[PDB]
Amino acid sequence: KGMKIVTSFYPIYAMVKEVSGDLNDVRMIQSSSGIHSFEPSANDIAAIYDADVFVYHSHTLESWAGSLDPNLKKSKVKVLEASEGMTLERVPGLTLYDPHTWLDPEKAGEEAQIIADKLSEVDSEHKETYQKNAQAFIKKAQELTKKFQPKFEKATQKTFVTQLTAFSYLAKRFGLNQLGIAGISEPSPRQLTEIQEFVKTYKVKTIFTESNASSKVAETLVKSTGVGLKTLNPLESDPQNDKTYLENLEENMSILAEELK
Ligand SMILES: [Zn+2]
Ligand SMILES: [Zn+2]
Ligand SMILES: [Zn+2]
Ligand SMILES: [Zn+2]
Ligand SMILES: [Zn+2]
Ligand SMILES: [Zn+2]
Ligand SMILES: [Zn+2]
Ligand SMILES: [Zn+2]
Ligand SMILES: [Zn+2]
Ligand SMILES: [Zn+2]
Ligand SMILES: [Zn+2]
Ligand SMILES: [Zn+2]
C-alpha cells in the first residue's frame, strides 16, 4: 500500500509495475476494444482525478491526456508523460508520429528510465528503489537485444509483411523492414494480380496479423495472397497471462526470428 497509480494502457501499466517494484498499488483504465482511438468514460476520468498519480505514454497517442488540469479541480493528481522528450519518428508519406515506441526493448528501457525519474521526483522516500528497479529492466531489455541481434544478422530475409504496421521501432532495432498489404475487405481482378506481383517480389512466405484479428480479414488475406497467417501482438491490450513484459516482447521477436531464419 502506497501511491495510488492509474495507467492508460497495458505497456505503461507493466513498466510502472516493474519500476515501482511493488512499492505501491497500480491500476489501469480498462480500455474496451481499441486504445488507439479511445476517449475515457466518466468513471475513468473521475478515478484518475482522485489518484496520487496518472501516467500516460505520449501526447501523440493519448490526446485526451492534455485535456486534464488538476489545478482547476480535485488536485491530488500528478500527470506524468512516460515518454517526455523521447525521439519519435514521422510516418512516411507526408504532424503525425509513430507512437509504437514500447515494442522496441531498448526504447522500452528508455521509457522505463523516464518513468523512474519522474516517479522518484514525486516519491522521494523510495527514489533509490525506483532507479534500482528501472536499471535492472534496462539490463534485461539489453540482454534480450543482444540475444536476438546476431540471429537477425544471420537472417536470410530481413523483411516481413503485416496487416498491423505497428512495428517500425522493433524493425529498426534489428535492421528489418515492415510492409503492408494493399487489399482489405472483396478485391478486384486487378488488385489480385498486383498482390501476386507483390508477394513474388518480396518472396513473402507468410503474412502477419494482429493478435485476435478478425476472421473476415484473415479469410480474404489467405485467399488473396495464398500464404498462411502468423500473429504479432502490439501489446495495445494486456494479454492476460503470467509472462513479464520483456517476455511478451521476446515472443514477438521469436516469431519473427523463426519466420526470417
Ligand atoms: Zn496516500
Ligand atoms: Zn488495433
Ligand atoms: Zn497502435
Ligand atoms: Zn508530450
Ligand atoms: Zn530516445
Ligand atoms: Zn534521500
Ligand atoms: Zn514511496
Ligand atoms: Zn544496440
Ligand atoms: Zn478470433
Ligand atoms: Zn497480466
Ligand atoms: Zn528470455
Ligand atoms: Zn502469448
Side-chain angles (χ1 to χ4, degrees):
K1 295 174 184 177
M3 271 164 63
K4 175 162 178 161
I5 314 191
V6 290
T7 67
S8 48
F9 76 137
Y10 170 59
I12 301 307
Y13 170 97
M15 289 172 166
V16 173
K17 182 175 173 183
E18 285 235 20
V19 163
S20 173
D22 302 0
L23 284 172
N24 42 259
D25 289 345
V26 188
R27 316 189 188 293
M28 163 200 334
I29 309 196
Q30 261 305 354
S31 17
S32 187
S33 287
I35 293 72
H36 220 134
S37 63
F38 137 105
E39 305 264 326
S41 59
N43 305 5
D44 303 327
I45 187 164
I48 62 182
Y49 262 128
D50 190 0
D52 291 333
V53 46
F54 152 73
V55 357
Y56 66 108
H57 174 71
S58 179
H59 69 290
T60 184
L61 164 55
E62 294 111 326
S63 58
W64 54 265
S67 305
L68 282 55
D69 45 9
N71 292 24
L72 297 135
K73 296 185 177 177
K74 300 177 182 177
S75 64
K76 288 185 179 179
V77 181
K78 304 291 185 180
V79 176
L80 279 49
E81 181 172 332
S83 65
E84 191 193 27
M86 292 204 63
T87 309
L88 273 49
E89 59 199 10
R90 293 174 288 177
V91 299
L94 285 300
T95 173
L96 284 173
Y97 299 104
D98 189 334
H100 297 100
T101 278
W102 63 87
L103 291 159
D104 178 332
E106 273 190 34
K107 239 70 186 298
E110 243 161 40
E111 191 168 355
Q113 183 63 53
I114 293 178
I115 285 171
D117 290 350
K118 290 196 173 187
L119 230 56
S120 40
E121 195 272 343
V122 175
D123 189 77
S124 317
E125 301 194 343
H126 297 143
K127 68 166 290 185
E128 287 77 13
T129 301
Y130 296 162
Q131 298 300 328
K132 180 182 70 190
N133 305 134
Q135 275 298 349
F137 189 82
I138 312 304
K139 198 166 183 296
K140 287 177 286 180
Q142 199 69 79
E143 297 171 348
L144 207 186
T145 293
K146 198 178 184 183
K147 169 175 171 180
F148 281 74
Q149 173 173 344
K151 56 182 62 172
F152 280 111
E153 167 63 317
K154 299 184 181 64
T156 65
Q157 177 173 214
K158 302 178 186 300
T159 168
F160 61 94
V161 182
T162 173
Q163 173 67 352
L164 196 68
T165 50
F167 308 92
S168 312
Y169 295 86
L170 171 60
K172 286 187 183 62
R173 184 84 287 153
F174 303 102
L176 317 181
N177 299 268
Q178 75 169 2
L179 303 107
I181 287 297
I184 94 98
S185 52
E186 39 174 279
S188 160
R190 165 171 286 287
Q191 293 175 319
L192 247 56
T193 303
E194 294 188 11
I195 294 172
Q196 302 306 347
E197 277 177 342
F198 171 78
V199 170
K200 255 203 61 40
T201 296
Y202 281 81
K203 303 174 184 176
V204 182
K205 290 163 55 267
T206 273
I207 301 292
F208 286 106
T209 65
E210 185 175 14
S211 50
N212 288 93
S214 67
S215 186
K216 288 185 176 181
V217 79
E219 212 169 63
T220 54
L221 272 179
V222 169
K223 194 181 291 165
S224 302
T225 74
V227 311
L229 261 47
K230 290 186 194 192
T231 178
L232 257 52
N233 192 331
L235 312 146
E236 257 153 82
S237 90
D238 181 1
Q240 271 118 5
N241 73 42
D242 277 41
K243 283 212 282 203
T244 90
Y245 182 81
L246 293 170
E247 291 174 342
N248 288 318
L249 273 57
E250 190 174 358
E251 183 166 359
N252 275 11
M253 49 197 71
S254 286
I255 303 307
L256 270 169
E258 177 58 16
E259 176 57 37
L260 296 176
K261 295 172 72 66

